[PDB]
Each structure stands twice: as structure tokens, then as C-alpha cells.
Amino acid sequence: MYVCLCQGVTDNQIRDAIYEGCCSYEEVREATGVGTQCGKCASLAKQVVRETLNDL
Numbered sequence: 286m287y288v289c290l291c292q293g294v295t296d297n298q299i300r301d302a303i304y305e306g307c308c309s310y311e312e313v314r315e316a317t318g319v320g321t322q323c324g325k326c327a328s329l330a331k332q333v334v335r336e337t338l339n340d341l
């Protein structure tokens with residue numbers, strides 16, 4: 286699904302950003318743009334980050 290409609294970032298793209306090097310929402314934000322516009326998706330994006338890290 287789209288986590289961030291403003292930037293067109295999917296849950297899979299957040300996971301892949303982590304697999305590819307990111308360790309934090311802040312890094313995923315800079316790498317993908319998630320949460321940089323209205324910011325309403327930040328909590329959901331942080332949930333995806335937390336879930337992905339816990340699964341590693």
C-alpha cells in the first residue's frame with residue numbers, strides 16, 4: 286500500500302530503504318521523501334520502520 290500519498294511511497298519501499306542501508310525514520314525520510322510534505326503519514330511510516338527492524 287501507499288504509506289505516503291504525497292510522495293508516492295509504499296510500505297515495500299520503506300522496507301527496501303532499510304534493507305538497503307537506512308536504520309531510522311529520519312534516514313528513510315531523506316532517502317525516499319516519505320513524510321516530507323503534509324507529514325500525516327509519519328506515524329505509519331515509523332511503524333513500518335519499527336516492524337522491519339524488529340524482523341531483522
Ligand code: FES
Pocket residue numbers: 288289290291292319320321322323324325326327
Ligand atoms: S501523506 Fe506523506 S507527507 Fe503527506
